Amino acid sequence: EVCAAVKAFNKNQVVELTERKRQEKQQEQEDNMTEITNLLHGDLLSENPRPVASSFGSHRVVL
Amino acid sequence: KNFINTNAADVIMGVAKKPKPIYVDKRTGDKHDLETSGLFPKYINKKDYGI
Amino acid sequence: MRECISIHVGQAGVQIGNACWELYCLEHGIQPDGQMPDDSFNTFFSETGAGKHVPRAVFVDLEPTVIDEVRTGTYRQLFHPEQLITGKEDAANNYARGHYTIGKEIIDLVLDRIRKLADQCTGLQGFLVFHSFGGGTGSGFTSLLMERLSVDYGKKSKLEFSIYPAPQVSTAVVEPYNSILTTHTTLEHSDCAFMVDNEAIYDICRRNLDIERPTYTNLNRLIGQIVSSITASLRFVDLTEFQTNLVPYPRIHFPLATYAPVISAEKAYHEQLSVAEITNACFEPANQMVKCDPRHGKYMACCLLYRGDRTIQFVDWCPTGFKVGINYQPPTVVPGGDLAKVQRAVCMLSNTTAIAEAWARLDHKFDLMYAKRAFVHWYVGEGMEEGEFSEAREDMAALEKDYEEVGV
Amino acid sequence: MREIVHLQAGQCGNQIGAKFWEVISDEHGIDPTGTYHGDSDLQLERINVYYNEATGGKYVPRAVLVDLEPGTMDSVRSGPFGQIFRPDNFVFGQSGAGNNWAKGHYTEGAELVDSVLDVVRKEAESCDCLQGFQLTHSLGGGTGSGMGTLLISKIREEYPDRIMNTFSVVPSPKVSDTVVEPYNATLSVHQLVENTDETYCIDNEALYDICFRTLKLTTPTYGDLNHLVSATMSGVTTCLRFPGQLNADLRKLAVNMVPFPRLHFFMPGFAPLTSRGSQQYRALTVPELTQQMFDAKNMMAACDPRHGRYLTVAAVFRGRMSMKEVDEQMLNVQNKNSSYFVEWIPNNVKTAVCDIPPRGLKMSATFIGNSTAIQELFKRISEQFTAMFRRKAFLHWYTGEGMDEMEFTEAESNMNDLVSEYQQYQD
Amino acid sequence: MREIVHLQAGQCGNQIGAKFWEVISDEHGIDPTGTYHGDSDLQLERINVYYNEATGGKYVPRAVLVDLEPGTMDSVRSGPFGQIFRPDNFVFGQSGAGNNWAKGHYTEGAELVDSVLDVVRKEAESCDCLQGFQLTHSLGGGTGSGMGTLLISKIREEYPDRIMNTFSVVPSPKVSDTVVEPYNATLSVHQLVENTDETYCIDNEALYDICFRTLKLTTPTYGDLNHLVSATMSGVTTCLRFPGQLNADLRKLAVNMVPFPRLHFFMPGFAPLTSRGSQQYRALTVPELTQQMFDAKNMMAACDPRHGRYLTVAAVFRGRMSMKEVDEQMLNVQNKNSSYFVEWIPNNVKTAVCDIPPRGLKMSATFIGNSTAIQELFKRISEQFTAMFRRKAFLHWYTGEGMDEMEFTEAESNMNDLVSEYQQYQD
């Protein structure tokens, strides 16, 4: 009986550990998507010319 | 050149290959070397030992 | 009346003591606030008249950014705010900074708080010092602490739990200089130093448990289990009989450590864990906590701590070599931990001849550096003479011939 | 409570610093006014390492901006982040150095060090425990090299137990834009060997190489080479501000890569540098950081580490990662290469792990390698210094400032011996 | 656990090996963008033999495309499945080989050989246990054969325990679209002798006999010939990817068919090739797969094994089928014929059964045979090399590239002994 409830607790714990592993893998894929989306939106790889705009005015640029 | 005689002579007058010792740890075939892990006694054989 | 003052020096000490004190809180009823929602906590806790329970520990570091997380974490209300001692600048992997220049700013404060903690306890068994050989503070300030504790606290037990440097992996370049210059000055000032290294616990957490890529917390929890199994007979043998039954000669105080069932909850269902199984699994070289092998040496002593319900060859002069202790409380599972729930466990502390290869490798790497005088200017300029390298090396030469002499 | 004072000289040191401070302020949530607009509590916790609190919640940097002409103090003041700098910290003279070392060291810069040392003695007294200084300057100019190595010699006599990093832009033989380059570079490497604790060597032909073959930029400006440098400049101070599992001071890195007191010229690198086309191919793990960190396409200096032994190596990781995987890749890169690592140092690589990644990344890393392939960098200078000086090509500018010819002879054998000093551990 | 790093060289080498990947990817259920859309798990459990993982559940092949001109590395990219490859693995030079074997072996392909052994080591040291490489090339061109033997000559020395398979397209006997063919092929078969574990021999003329006489197509093309090569490439390496009742690796065929180390030239084939109209009558049983492996019209080399003797025979069966009925037919052909089998090997046939069939078929079969009628190939290359080389015809297009005339004289006598080697296992 005591062996039975220890084995049942072990089986249940195996189910929760497997679900925790699945959850952290899916969260890793989410962070990968955030990685690549932010790096494509970044101005270094987009090369938008607006980064040459200067606070002094719209006629002068940053060298 | 007698290829049959030379092939036989090459495979009789020689030496055998000596493998690097490798031990498997897990049940899924994980392979590691032996002489650089801490198991087989290698570094007590040094001549500096105890002095 | 059976207290144990704990001292945690270094980042290794603080991050191990976090796991240890979480387990100590959960074994009794103590919430992380400090209130219980029986007096067996008295070996580790103090009962303020305002209902609060305060631990008997001192956390020391020369850097503030690993104690500030304890100060802002979940266990913020539990600790006395001045049982956590911090410096401003760390020791920077330098035994000289950690011994002579920086550690002298904190040694008096640590001794003051230790005296204040030891005045509460009626019957004090001894101290437990958690440290790491490789770091700056854990190698310099720890040795300075034992030097200034030997003259102050008598013939008390001074147990050490150390992270000995691993045989092939380390997180520093300058580690062997520390690892020899601390052993030379703690050889005569200690009673028993259980040594576990991180590489063997990585092997066990990969192999026994199925945790590929573990972090330090999965190691700190197993260390906490071993310390609880050592001290559990005070709460539910003593600390005092360990130094009698493990250290024959006064320089050979270096035993080992093992916990017998370290298995996952998806393989505790498949097997018995009877006393013969766990006793056999203590003496297996795959389950030791130092990457070494006691087949290639000779056993000298063994202490077997059971908890809950012709290959092994001994030395000539010690035929018996066994001390056995039995406790009745089974080990307690923490939520989020990785071990199973079990009814029986064993912790074996064994003194063996097969640790000579560790000192031989350490001396080899110290020689390899120091023959060409690398890194010496850092250690010389921080108030430390050069000749101490020569005395530490000839002293550890004497130690290797000691390990051969006793075996012969 | 381990504060860092930033010192920055020349046009090169003022245009690196305008981009470094543009990176730190994003990392701590500071807008161009100076008010904290962030979404954590870790950012505000140790902002005092670089920022001084003002009244009203403002934060101003602990930087001193020096120059010898007033022309580069206006483009800094007219950038996006130019209004956070305290206006007293701009110290600028009205007659330039003119690509001349001697005017920077004896005539013009010597009348300005006493008006800069007043400023740095004001930010050395706001710190409860000052860690050390920082200089960014160019070795190929006249006021980065004359005044800049005049300040270090005067700082190191007043704060002699601190830490004095530099980020030297050493001249390149290919990307070079001054005839009188090797006179200033020879007379300044002589001034860095006995007055710094660490000196990271940067060549501009190695930053163009990274921006052409790895990031694949069409037109890299100087603003895209100042972003490469400033990502390493905050990668070595990142455990002083954010917590971790295994920290590293700047002092702890001085201990482990300086075996002998004159061997402190390193080569930086930064791990996750990638294109915009290769962003969905990259797998974002720790072995991919380690493969790119050690790549010889990747070092920020123009000397190849396949021509010499690696004396010692660093690694300063960021992110939430596994200490088993961090520690098993430094062992892995060390056992295949038997003769790329020096024999009398058995473990060469020191690792540290911080816990907070840069803004917009998952994890990152940094490399600070000490090699005996750095002595080819001081021999292309020493083959062009001696081609000119054997006939006295340009000396009349230099002699007529109070400077003698004998200083061009003592700064030859004092760099001819450092090449032989790095040579004796090459084999 | 058993990886294969694909190499492919030339315009022949890339137009073969771009159709092979469309064959494999629909054998495993991979859409043109790279993701997985399949209805099994045997399609996915052994996919690591050929496919590196990418992010988001996307798989990229382990293929490296080398070439010496950028025109044929944009028809590959603009095909149907051309977007699955990682773009770094595309390697192309800027100036062609020019059908010149010297130009690709010594001059143009000796600086490109250093730039591809960076690529092939990043893909070889990322495998858990490397089984062995491949190659696909032609012995008539310049970059397939000149540089393409320089690769095998080099990466046998660095990796001498692994497997090096090749899929040669040796020159055709009848059709010849290059005058300077025989200098290419004679100088290349010497490099195949020492450095290669297995080599198949494919003639483009004997691919034309299949696609007209047997498959009965109105218009064949170089996609209906690159489907025949790829349907033999998949048959040798399908017991690595799919379970069977009896397995056969890439080693277990080379162990059995290569007795002596100089004799590794084989003769492929493929059994169920039937027309639309004749399909109603054909496609019956397992005796109709052993009938058409061994038919002498189906060989993919233009050399007939009736002229000589099968040293060793092999067969790889695909489909879920009877372990008895496979074994009874190989007993049936080994006993009816006597002088088509060598005397000193009494079990000349090795057999293998793979469960998962090819795409669209319910059963299939594949052949490899090893003959002493493969040495009529080299007696026809050497009849047209020393025809030309007697009066020194095209010699300046090779000698002015850095060769000499006695590199020719040894390379014919490095073929006029392997001809007379095979003539002594004749009797």
From Swiss-Prot, chain A:
Microtubule inner protein (MIP) part of the dynein-decorated doublet microtubules (DMTs) in cilia axoneme, which is required for motile cilia beating. This is RIB43A-like with coiled-coils protein 2. It comes from the Eukaryota. It is found in: Cytoplasm, Cytoskeleton, Cilium axoneme; Cytoplasm, Cytoskeleton, Flagellum axoneme. Belongs to the RIB43A family. Microtubule inner protein component of sperm flagellar doublet microtubules. Residues 10-39 form a coiled coil.
Curated annotation (Swiss-Prot), chain B:
Disulfide bonds: none annotated. It is found in: Cytoplasm, Cytoskeleton, Cilium axoneme; Cytoplasm, Cytoskeleton, Flagellum axoneme. High expression in testis and vomeronasal organ and lower expression in ovary, heart, lung, and brain. Not expressed in other tissues. It comes from the Eukaryota. Adapter that functions to localize a calcium-sensitive signal transduction machinery in sperm to a calcium-permeable ion channel. Microtubule inner protein (MIP) part of the dynein-decorated doublet microtubules (DMTs) in cilia axoneme, which is required for motile cilia beating. Microtubule inner protein component of sperm flagellar doublet microtubules. Binds calmodulin via its IQ domain. Interacts with TRPC1, TRPC2, TRPC5, but not TRPC3. Interacts with CFAP45. The IQ motif is involved in calmodulin binding. This is Enkurin. The lineage of its organism: Eukaryota, Metazoa, Chordata, Craniata, Vertebrata.
UniProtKB/Swiss-Prot annotation, chain C:
The modification 3'-nitrotyrosine is found at Y269. Some glutamate residues at the C-terminus are polyglycylated, resulting in polyglycine chains on the gamma-carboxyl group. Glycylation is mainly limited to tubulin incorporated into axonemes (cilia and flagella) whereas glutamylation is prevalent in neuronal cells, centrioles, axonemes, and the mitotic spindle. Both modifications can coexist on the same protein on adjacent residues, and lowering polyglycylation levels increases polyglutamylation, and reciprocally. Cilia and flagella glycylation is required for their stability and maintenance. Flagella glycylation controls sperm motility. It is an enzyme of class 3 (hydrolase). Mg(2+) binds at E63. It holds the Pfam family Tubulin. It is found in: Cytoplasm, Cytoskeleton; Cytoplasm, Cytoskeleton, Flagellum axoneme. GTP binds at residues 10-12, 15, 63, 91, 132, 135-138, 171, 175, 198, 216, 220, 239. Its EC number is 3.6.5.-. The keyword Thylakoid does not apply. The active site is at E241. It catalyses: GTP + H2O = GDP + phosphate + H(+). It comes from the Eukaryota. Keywords: Acetylation, Cell projection, Cilium, Cytoplasm, Cytoskeleton, Flagellum, GTP-binding, Hydrolase, Isopeptide bond, Magnesium, Metal-binding, Methylation, Microtubule, Nitration, Nucleotide-binding, Phosphoprotein. Its cofactor is Mg(2+). GO terms for molecular function: GTP binding; hydrolase activity; identical protein binding; metal ion binding; protein heterodimerization activity; protein-containing complex binding; structural constituent of cytoskeleton. The keyword Hydrolase applies. One of its GO terms (biological process) is gene expression. This is Tubulin alpha-1A chain.
From Swiss-Prot, chains D, E:
One of its GO terms (cellular component) is tubulin complex. Mg(2+) binds at E69. Widely expressed. Expressed in the retina and the cochlea. GTP binds at Q11, E69, S138, G142, T143, G144, N204, N226. GO terms for molecular function: double-stranded RNA binding; GTP binding; GTPase activity; metal ion binding; structural constituent of cytoskeleton. Gene3D superfamilies: Helix hairpin bin (1.10.287.600), Tubulin/FtsZ, C-terminal domain (3.30.1330.20), Tubulin/FtsZ, GTPase domain (3.40.50.1440). Pfam families: Tubulin, Tubulin_C. It is found in: Cytoplasm, Cytoskeleton; Cytoplasm, Cytoskeleton, Flagellum axoneme. Its main location: cytoplasm. InterPro entries: Beta-tubulin_BS, Beta_tubulin, Tub_FtsZ_C, Tubulin, Tubulin/FtsZ-like_C, Tubulin/FtsZ_2-layer-sand-dom, Tubulin/FtsZ_GTPase_sf, Tubulin_C. The modification Phosphoserine is found at S172. The keyword Secreted does not apply. The modification N6-acetyllysine is found at K58. Some glutamate residues at the C-terminus are polyglycylated, resulting in polyglycine chains on the gamma-carboxyl group. Glycylation is mainly limited to tubulin incorporated into axonemes (cilia and flagella) whereas glutamylation is prevalent in neuronal cells, centrioles, axonemes, and the mitotic spindle. Both modifications can coexist on the same protein on adjacent residues, and lowering polyglycylation levels increases polyglutamylation, and reciprocally. Cilia and flagella glycylation is required for their stability and maintenance. Flagella glycylation controls sperm motility. PANTHER family: TUBULIN (PTHR11588). Belongs to the tubulin family.
